[PDB]
Amino acid sequence: LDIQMTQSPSSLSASLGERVSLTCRASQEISGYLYWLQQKPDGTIKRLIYAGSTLDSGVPKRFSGSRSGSDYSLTISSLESEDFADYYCLQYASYPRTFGGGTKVEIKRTVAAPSVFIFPPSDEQLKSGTASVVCLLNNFYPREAKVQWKVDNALQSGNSQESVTEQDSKDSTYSLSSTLTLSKADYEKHKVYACEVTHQGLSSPVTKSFNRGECGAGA
Amino acid sequence: VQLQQSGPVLVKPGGSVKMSCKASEYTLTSYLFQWVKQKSGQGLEWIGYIYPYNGGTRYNEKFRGKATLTSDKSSNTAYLELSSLTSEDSAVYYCARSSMSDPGANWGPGTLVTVSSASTKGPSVFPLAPSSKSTSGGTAALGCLVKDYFPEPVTVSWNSGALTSGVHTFPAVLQSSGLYSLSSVVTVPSSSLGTQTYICNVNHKPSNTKVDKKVEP
């Protein structure tokens, strides 16, 4: 019935400059009617290959498509940071059109310690009744990172959420935000807000903090 | 070069939604429009095609006939209507224009559909002011906290698109309140803080909210 497209590997982490190949096997004969697409973190999808080996005119030469019987491959001759993305093959020999499960292509790079920044809540937000304290871990690698919050030296729990970006297209690093949310009352009753960051790139935890009294600067 | 797709929409479960896709220029050549579905963080699923030329259509049986594709040959616009919506229909829907000789040549940006009973809510935009607490060396980080909005998405640009380098707009986080929040930050030269203005341009189409917040040190 429907043609199943088995894409492998599901995740492929590779060093910069490495030759990498993604594979898609069709459960049926697709006679070279295989399509490859790239989807960047922002959701943008672009055609890479069609007819199994025909390269889209707007795609760099490092990309190539090949067929080995029932096995179809997408190869990147030398991995570049901007190749970080999700890749999918797509059979169009018959209907329904079916896609491979995709491959998340991750970039291995050197360790990079994060730059840590802290932001006190804006007075504008305070007038609202809630206070958001933002801690930023910028451009680090690997992704593994620990962020803890301390308010007047007391470790916080359950009142923070973090978000992490996908690897940067230019330097393959990650950035992470940790947001501490408190009521205005609670924010005003405490003084020292500290963000403690632990990361492989740091020999010892990095603590960035501010005194609400000093505003969030040097008053 | 991409196609044009209708904006993000919030629709209630049990309702229906109709989105559009059309080529930018009036390029009136007989093309085929392929529609693809993608749930947040998941893979791609073919929905069906509409061939405006002869009205030909074909649907992935997995949609159980809930998807209907139509087109306006006059405007070369293709429409995908999804009925009896449920949360499973919350996803980004893409259209691709193609032909036998030029398969999946162009892709649209996708239309984000959120099926929910919750009402839309525009975000509040707060500055993440640069200070000695966000300055390392000659680099200062600043940003905007786009808080309490629903549904996704919000778009954030800096200085009307003039500032793209060093910008990190984080994935939205669903708060316990059921509202989303995200921060967009950017690192800039600390020496520019006194001369260069930094404004985050936030737009939340579902609530028809457009806010330009200047971030001061």
Ligand SMILES: CC(=O)Nc1ccc(CP(=O)([O-])O[C@@H](C)c2ccccc2)cc1
């Ligand atoms: C008669 C006629 O119009 N035939 C015809 C038209 C188009 C195509 C190419 P196609 O639309 O099947 O190409 C594939 C790769 C595709 C599937 C789903 C989304 C995007 C792209 C193949 C055949």
